[model samples]
Target chain A: GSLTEDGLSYKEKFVVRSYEVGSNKTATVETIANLLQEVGCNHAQSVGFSTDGFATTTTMRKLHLIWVTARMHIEIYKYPAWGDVVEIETWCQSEGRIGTRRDWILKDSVTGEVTGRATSKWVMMNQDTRRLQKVSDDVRDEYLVFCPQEPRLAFPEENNRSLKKIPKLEDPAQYSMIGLKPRRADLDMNQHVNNVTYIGWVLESIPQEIVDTHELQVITLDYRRECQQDDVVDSLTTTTSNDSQFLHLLRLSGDGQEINRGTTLWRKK
Target chain B: GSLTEDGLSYKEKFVVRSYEVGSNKTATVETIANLLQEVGCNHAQSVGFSTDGFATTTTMRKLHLIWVTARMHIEIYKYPAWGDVVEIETWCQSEGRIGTRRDWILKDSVTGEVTGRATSKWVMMNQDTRRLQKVSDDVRDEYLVFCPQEPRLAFPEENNRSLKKIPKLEDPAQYSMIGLKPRRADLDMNQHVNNVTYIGWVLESIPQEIVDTHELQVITLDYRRECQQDDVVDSLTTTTSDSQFLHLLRLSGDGQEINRGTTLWRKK
Candidate 1:
């Protein structure tokens, strides 16, 4: 028989079909972090594994889920050393009234160095009633047996530094400001604004005068609160003393609800 | 009896609801030209009329069917002076087995100067069977009353000269290229690629190397064929000397079939 041919065989029941690297080879930490959310939702035990303190890998643990306990958190211990392989593993674990637990291990697939790990508890909800339910015992037991384990670490506390605290203006006199309006298209499937879409908006919101004159170097965004669709936003931009760095502050038009604030370092060629 | 009420008598059955100069105002001609194809398909007449000569205002004839020219086949006789009000008039004439005849005029709204004019015949087709049929008399009479005493000019012939020819290159250099893999996210309700999505692809396909090195001046696109959900196309670009130009040629894996053309001019 073929490896994935049998109905109840482990390969047929629990196997990855394919993998794709994004078009941009230099994967963003945010993209990998989003992938981990998909990892957690698919596997119940994915919340239990942990990570060494790599800033990028640990950030995945902080991703917000709509329901359930914020299970299985990771803290990067040392940023994965250069040339470390980052692998994500998925498997099932013990079951309860909620659902079966599935676990994952993100490791340096090359050096076998563990980069990050997670364990999540998932519950299948009744489609009509929307109540927590359980899977068939046979399927649940199969997942528990297939779960894999690596070393574990303590969960990291949430990073709660305020984006507003970042110093934006040194000399307000020299910089020109422009206004931005966030239209309906900026929202994503999440109903709230998508993280990457915000990056594009921030880049677009730069004044025509600034964009024509300078080159962007580095960008750092601290997401404050989710901006829903049709929400009007005001983007304020100011230049730093070096003239090479531009800082932006974006807030909801009315109520002054902070959506996101970031700094883009620029160079005039 | 509100003038703007939905079922009011004497109100136009079909109206140009919204029109605007789009973000890329300079490319408005190409945009309006492309919109003609979409509007053309929705027009009551699918086939065109076979008139040999221009019709003068006094000799203007009423067309039976209410047909609109969805596509604007235009040859720029002269560029409109800046800020000139381009007046547009539309009318329907006769219905035929393959299509119906519709005429349009582009005039200077302020000066009453006739800038450009065109007439086209369209055929009505069964939406389900995709077969051409003669329009009903009742439908024809309803639109004929709207044809006023306006002169109509001959329709421009298809510009075969501007149509892209298959490029020939020997020892083609490894110029920078961009790739877009169609995903579920890219598909629309039509199950074919959305027209706007293709525009986005064209924008993304501009070589990063060229954008970084030079300043962009103008962009023009000629859409040739519909792309399906599964179709993966390669956008190949080449630079020519005179225009400081870049041409985007799209082809499916079969290689010979050209799907679309995009051209951009830049400053050295």
Candidate 2:
């Protein structure tokens, strides 16, 4: 990632690898999420705000702090295929006293046209106590130098205010998939389940026919709590009046503690 | 990947990614295998021997054929940490009338010291019929131009001959992991469960203690059959008289058809 005109945003390019594509020969939503994570980490490193870990800053690392994602929203207009190079630009801004927001713009390198846009909210958490923490002046100074004077959102505030919040699923949803366990490979350096892994479970409960014939258009996730290795999860989904829309939930089977709540819109292929 | 001065081998460099490393903070065997596959495909593309699909030559694709691994062996002396750049060199050779062999050498880019070596055998298979096919003259000519006049092996013939063949796992193995299903992401472009995904199941059956304490030093696998999407597979491992050694098997649970056989040696 390199600094652009404003010295506020960092941009980088990546190849759409063969392994990252789906049966349609285009990159999948999971792959895009992974790319977003990579570029964000690269931006932090390029600006001298990162530690040895994935995305933690030097100040946060010294305080035994890690960033926990609170919300994420992505909308895709087109998907890149195998061997296609995609360029991404990402920048961060202070969301509130306790949270920060990061936004991304994805473009096809050859055509230089926008393909996708994403925005996410992250809050700091104490690693040992597993409790949410507030941003300190020192920690804020560590990364504020690279942020834009006026923050911008991928989705404007008016549109965001009009959109409906994803509601929690009630008892006995229309569809469900149970007994989902985390594979050893699914755990990251955080010693817990990574946020991206939750996306797989969210889609698992959807009908197979829909997955086969439709492409994901938009997805919004509200993470409720962290999932651990030993926990067994169950995914549930309920259909809306519109066949293309669905509401999803992932929760612990034993205690019924919600892990994540999500909603998705799909476009017919 | 660039063609070497001899024009026989191809070399490429890659950074060990943060996600590729495990709890130990070093690249695992599965990561190395994925890297090998990537470099080999890049090599094929660089030499104009590749089709749009991975590792398939234009001639082979025209004939509706694909290469399938028959056997593989890898030895690791050191593991690269995250952000470390490692260079790999790969070359292929004719094995016989119907089979070919490929070899790889891994080196740390900064120090230029050898860290690992791998060798594997591949045979052509008809995509539609799923039957082994002989390498035709045209297919041979396409890639043989880049191969060495005299082929070389990563391991000497004498050492290869001295190694014991990995035997089949008999009934009632000591450890077992059942109900393993392929995730949607596990399938490759060939529309089959990929060869690399098998390594995960092989390690799943081992006790967690061994996996945590012992780093994999050597692994040898013999491919018996291909696994499909809906197949429910089972992995079995039996401890040898030597605690650090084990024999392994991966088979379909319904029919007990062997998918792969393997042996591994670990150093404490």
Candidate 3:
């Protein structure tokens, strides 16, 4: 799968904020997730499908309500620190009859090097039913963005490359935390717990010693299911053979429904 | 004192993401704080000052580290929501010989409407010593960004304009919570708990029932202190009145000064 080509696809610039940076001074995984989320939102707005229907007017009844992430895969190379400007380019197209695929490349604004890349799947839901909607031909025909096809201009990378690497809940216990409640602050406009909140829970599960002693090099998470505002999620982490690496899993406390699963590679401090 | 130029001094663009948007699809206060922080950092980098000196290849013996936030004031008019591109302009100058002053105006990228404005104060700190530094002449001369003198363009509004209106602790116990802790997720590159993380403590301190009902219309926080890696903070809030409200005073559970704030509310 080649990325959108030519010089750059629809590009946007972001300045890494102090709050967005990690202890290592580079952008945190959550911040990267936020940027990628914005890229998709920006894509939707640019194509006439926007979220202004309920903005300031607050009534969720519309022909199209919102699109939510089904799954996402991100691979991090180098992280940008506070004050570092990053240029991001993203594009979306129909993945199937029911899913739309979006991909992105994060670059260093100063040196023009690719910092990270991501691939995510999304599907629209009916506001009234709160159920998934198919990607109708008309919808796909009008808004489907095409990745530029060229020889030298292609960065044909694939996501889910790390799919085999995750916690299967195989071990009974390693380093885990439970009774993590989702509070009022976790919910977003969709009346669901926003994506970034889950990432924070992942941070909570990592062994405190590892958290204190190692800095994360890369983080990859797959959003398996959505958690509600009042749900209590449990977190579990396992030590990989590599002394500096670990895997995390967050599941619903009620029925063990997996909400998120990921791996974090860290560097010793 | 006036602002930077005819309308706004400098201009930068931001896209409000789905995560940053609140339950109303508008940007949250924490999201706004993150933006303002970026505006200041952009201003610094645009002027050749940067934070990379203390970055990864680290050992602590670094010079000309960085000064962080001391105080800030924000007033919101309209909130930018998901998919909306926001243009923000920020400028900074020396605050006498000891501090620096910065201000901002957030505008709508689509319509160019004035969405909100803010002002803030910051000071330099020697990273190795962890102490505040003065804005010496050379420091002042090189980096003081100027704003053209104009009363209207200058939204020199104060942060604690409603400080006197906050709830008093006279009742000894109105609404409060204590011994809140900051975790690994709470700390930032500054090696301190983020200002937004403190706001989370403010929520834990508020009565749960009240927090559920009240829609925060306005928030005013004056950060007087900072929390390092291993410090537990105490949080206290009080009800000032029925229509208006007040008081979120934070101190160190480890024993020291922290931040104090107040909020205004609407029915629903």
Candidate 4:
């Protein structure tokens, strides 16, 4: 007698609702930590969180999660009082596989719309063996019980393209499009621009057109050189693909040194 | 016919405690506010506030009293978070034909030591007429009932001094003795030096010898120009009279004009 059954079952979707505020708000870190605890995760074990490159709610040395445990002992690092909020929704697609993909969508709660989304592959390693292990059936079943089935397109559709070039500075029509002036607050003790603030400058440079229309998916940045206090710098960006998708490159204006690059995907709702 | 005295009087003294942190872990504004409130004034109104001109505390603000009501109300434009705890003591010194002189002592809480002291003259006003009235026996009696007999000296003995010359650019050797660089966090949106920060700079520029030995009572500042971002400023202080003090100023590299300030103090 042979068993007639489908071999490895795969579940595609899941949805969970949680509130997240922008790093700009004063109590956002503590609020998020409480939300995570309420949703059933051990605070101590819940490390390794990831967020898109932006000005952090916490200092460069402190993580957002520590605020709850430290309580009154928490130090006041930097307080930026204003900014926009982005919400995050995370889900697991395949449970029992060697490499499981966890997807996330960062939405704007007020408008009930997504602003950013990302997917990260995680490999579970056995503590004793220090090797990756296949997730057990029990684990898979647990996820399936809560998971929903809805097909959503993968982000950043594969494409072969390069960024468009703006005319050189010598050309009269091609003038500087972006400018950055450093303030005293911009410098740290070592006299270099605080690394975190640089990310803020990059975000500030994004044109309002794309920000109003589409969601940001992924951002990758590379630090080329150190910028000092009182330094006035220039920035430029170029788009690569058509309407639905594209790669964006940001660079220092003079001498054209690369600062950071990113790609984004979007769909009309 | 004889007049009888009847009124409310009170005196209180507090030691400066050690627990105030600022942006730089110096005493903060909140601590200063608490100390002033504990000194027993029923009503405290702000007269002026500024930052960065003083060293020990960067944020500086002044308050004027209109009336000492039954209920205490303190409004602080900004509070100190870090610095030495200052003990404030207050009492009614005199009630005469004109008005009453209320004296206060602001001291270092840690050692029960004196830092700065001040006194205010308040004229009794007729609520209906909205005019000042003479200090009647009844009002004086009320104040004397709670007032302490031995009030701390408004100006402690150490701060008496004479005018000194403003240090010049040629005196780099002298400037190094009192000069300091501003912290990154001290910068504000104008991208120029924050006005408040200049107060701290001025305060810091005072020579240690003068701070430890002199008393400051009345201080006034005149703003002539704004300090641009990335500009370095310096302050020079000299006593004009036995009871008055003068502060000379220059900013940016050298010869850049900022402002001048004056202060008056009395020896205890």
True contacts kept of each: 0.00, 0.18, 0.65, 0.00
- lDDT sort, best first: 2, 3, 1, 4
Tens-place lDDT per residue, model 3, B1-268, is 1223443345678877777776677787778877877666555544454366411112122344466666666667788976688888776555577676677888999999988877766777776666876756655554433433433233533654522333334435466655555655577665667777766666556665665565555666666667765566666766767244455555554446577666666655
DockQ by candidate, in order: 0.02, 0.44, 0.44, 0.03
Candidate 4: where are CA atoms >4 Å away? A1-192, A199-269, B1-193, B196-224, B228-254, B259-268
Cα error, residue B158 of model 4, in Å, equals 4.2
Best by TM-score: 2
**What tens-digit string does per-residue lDDT give for candidate 2 at A1-269?**
58788778889887777667777878888889878887787777777754456567678888898888988888888999877899998988986567789899999999999999998889988988989978888888777777886867777776562145778899889999876777666676555786778887888888878978999888899988988977889999998743398889999999898999989889898
- How accurate locally is residue B119 in candidate 1, as Cα lDDT from 0 to 100? 45
For residues B69-180, write the lDDT of model 4, one tens digit per residue. Answer: 2111122222222223444555555545665555555555556655544444445543334454465565455445444465543533554221112322233323221333
Whole-model Cα lDDT per candidate?
Answer: 0.39, 0.79, 0.65, 0.37
Better of 2 and 4 by lDDT: 2
Over B1-268, each residue of candidate 1 has an lDDT whose tens digit, in order, gives 0112321111111111111122222223323333332232223222232222122111222332222222222433332432244554455555433445555555555677665544444554333344445666555554454443343334534653223342442224234233333442233322335444454455444554554344343343444544654465555555566133343435446654223333444444
The candidate scoring highest on lDDT is 2
In candidate 1, how many Å is residue A91 off?
53
lDDT of 2 at B72: 77
- Chain B TM-score of model 1, please? 0.40
Docking class of 4: incorrect
lDDT of 3 by residue, A90-132 (tens): 8655666776666788999999999888776677666556777
